[PDB]
Amino acid sequence: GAMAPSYRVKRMDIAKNDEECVVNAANPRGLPGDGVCKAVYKKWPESFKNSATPVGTAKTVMCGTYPVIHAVGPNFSNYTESEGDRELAAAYREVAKEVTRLGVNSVAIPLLSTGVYSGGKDRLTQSLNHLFTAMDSTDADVVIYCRDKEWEKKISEAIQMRT
Ligand SMILES: Oc1ccc2c(c1)OCO2
Ligand SMILES: Oc1ccc2c(c1)OCO2
Ligand SMILES: [Cl-]
Ligand SMILES: [Cl-]
Ligand SMILES: [Cl-]
């Protein structure tokens, strides 16, 4: 575990993280995909061997000894708000199980279902609160990666609010 488990946020490419493992915002079919998933494919292509997994689940594949946790958020284009909310919560619970099993002291994590799976809605608060529900009981240092300067500020404020 970490000596004083923390949450942090950085505005940079998750493919350049400084943590002991990465969560991919994966598609269910293990395809290179777009956005975070494409950056992950370019950096850790070996981790997409037999990475296909259903919505609401996480499947870990090693790239050398570096774990890539493929976490499949719902595409809110296809799911109802209610069923999508349930699957998004579930995907983060499966990430917490994997991070615990791996015995890492730190993890790099994107906000699931906030980009091309967002169904055109701002889901910062929804996705972040599901991340917290899952990860609060873990002792890994969690570092959240985002792209947008206004998102960085809002994520930082939500972390600082609980401290
Ligand atoms: O400020 C940035 C945040 C995320 C990125 C990026 C720049 O390049 C690729 O992903
Ligand atoms: O398009 C992106 C690729 C990598 C990223 C990201 C966006 O935000 C964090 O890391
Ligand atoms: Cl970057
Ligand atoms: Cl997404
Ligand atoms: Cl973002």
Side-chain angles (χ1 to χ4, degrees):
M3 274 315 105
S6 70
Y7 287 108
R8 301 169 52 230
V9 56
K10 301 206 287 180
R11 190 189 75 96
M12 59 181 281
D13 192 346
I14 198 170
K16 306 189 218 181
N17 78 72
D18 193 27
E19 289 70 59
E20 290 184 356
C21 71
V22 69
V23 175
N24 182 31
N27 56 73
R29 307 181 178 273
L31 290 157
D34 319 284
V36 163
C37 188
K38 168 59 45 159
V40 167
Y41 184 72
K42 288 193 191 188
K43 182 56 62 174
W44 305 284
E46 299 93 339
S47 74
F48 289 70
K49 189 159 189 277
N50 289 308
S51 64
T53 199
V55 168
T57 76
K59 183 171 197 190
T60 303
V61 183
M62 310 302 293
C63 178
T65 68
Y66 187 81
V68 178
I69 305 173
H70 298 278
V72 184
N75 178 3
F76 278 95
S77 293
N78 300 331
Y79 285 89
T80 63
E81 286 293 338
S82 180
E83 204 77 356
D85 183 70
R86 176 181 64 75
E87 290 297 5
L88 179 57
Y92 282 115
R93 297 188 297 275
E94 298 303 304
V95 168
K97 296 177 187 171
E98 284 298 280
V99 165
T100 299
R101 184 180 67 73
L102 287 163
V104 295
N105 292 335
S106 64
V107 55
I109 193 164
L111 292 187
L112 302 176
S113 294
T114 63
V116 301
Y117 280 12
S118 70
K121 298 196 185 160
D122 175 343
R123 294 189 186 275
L124 191 174
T125 299
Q126 174 181 25
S127 185
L128 182 58
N129 281 339
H130 285 321
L131 188 162
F132 288 152
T133 299
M135 300 306 293
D136 276 350
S137 68
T138 71
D139 61 5
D141 282 336
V142 170
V143 183
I144 302 163
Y145 287 77
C146 68
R147 208 312 183 163
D148 183 86
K149 293 166 182 182
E150 295 308 307
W151 281 45
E152 182 185 14
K153 284 177 207 154
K154 286 182 274 194
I155 302 161
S156 182
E157 293 160 351
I159 292 167
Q160 294 328 133
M161 281 321 276
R162 347 163 69 211
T163 71

